[PDB]
C-alpha cells in the first residue's frame with residue numbers, strides 16, 4: 001500500500017493545542033443579530049455559498065456576507081472554527097459576525113469589507129515589484145495558517161482579495177480549509193482543477209500544508225508567464241498530463257515510486273514520455289519584464305512533484321525573489 005507521509009513542519013501544533021481548538025464539531029456557535037445587516041447586492045454564487053455586499057447598520061460600515069447553501073450547511077462548523085482560530089492573523093480575512101439568514105435558514109458569515117481592485121486590471125497591470133510584494137503578503141497568510149495547524153486547500157486568484165490602492169491583501173474562502181493531523185487521510189477532491197497539486201491528482205490522501213505551496217506556484221507561473229492558467233487541463237486526468245509536459249514524466253514516476261503510489265491505469269494511454277522543460281522555454285517578449293533568474297529559482301522550488309521537497313511558506317519568505325520588497 002501507500003507509504004505514509006507527514007509534514008516536515010508544524011506537525012505537532014494540533015497535539016500541542018487543546019482539543020477545543022481543533023474539535024470543531026464540539027464548538028457552540030454564538031449567533032449575532034441578522035437585523036444589523038442590510039444586503040446591498042449579490043457579488044457571486046458558487047457551489048457552496050452566495051456572497052453579498054452589505055452594510056452593518058450599527059456602524060454604517062460596508063461588510064461582506066456569505067450565505068451558506070444547505071449542501072454546505074453541514075461542515076459550517078469547520079469553517080467557523082477555522083475562521084475564529086485565525087482571526088487577527090496577517091492577511092487573513094476577519095470574521096466579524098455569524099447570523100442566521102431568515103430566508104435560507106442557514107448560517108451567514110459576516111466579514112470585513114475589502115474594496116477589491118478589478119481582477120483583470122490587477123493581472124494586466126501589476127509590476128514585477130507588485131507581484132513580489134503581493135506574493136510576500138500571501139506567504140505571510142500561509143505561514144500563519146500553517147503554523148496554526150490549518151491548510152487552506154483552495155488557494156487560487158479568486159480566493160485572494162486585493163485592494164491595490166491600500167496595498168491590502170486578504171486570503172478568503174476558508175470553507176475547504178482543514179486542520180492538519182499527521183497520518184490523516186484527506187479527501188483528494190479539494191481546490192480548483194488548475195491549482196490541484198500532483199498529490200491530489202495521483203490520489204495520495206496523506207497530504208499536508210505543502211499542497212497550498214503548489215497552488216501558490218501555479219498562481220505565480222500564470223502571472224509571470226502571462227499564461228492563464230499555467231497548467232490548463234481539460235479534466236483532472238489531463239491536468240496531470242499538462243503538469244508532466246512541463247516537469248517531465250521521469251520525476252513523476254520517481255514521486256509515485258517513492259510513496260508506492262499506483263497511477264490510475266487510465267494514465268497508460270495518455271501520459272506518454274516527456275522530458276522536464278527548462279523554465280526559460282516559457283519566456284517571450286511579452287513577459288520578459290516579469291521574469292528574472294530569482295523568479296524562476298523560486299518557482300522551481302514550489303513546483304515540485306514531491307510534496308515533502310517544496311519550499312515551506314516561512315523558508316520561501318527568505319528567498320532572494322523577495323529581497324527587493326520593502327519590509
Ligand SMILES: CCc1ccccc1-c1c(Cl)cc(CNCCc2nc3ccccc3[nH]2)cc1Cl
Nearest residue numbers: 043116119122123131134157158160161219223
Ligand atoms: C494571478 C494571481 C496572482 C499572482 C501573483 C500576484 C498577484 C496575483 C493576483 C491577482 Cl493578479 C489578482 C487577484 C485578485 N483576485 C480577486 C478575487 C476576488 N475578488 C472578489 C470580490 C468579491 C467576492 C469574492 C472575490 N474574490 C489576486 C491575486 Cl493573488
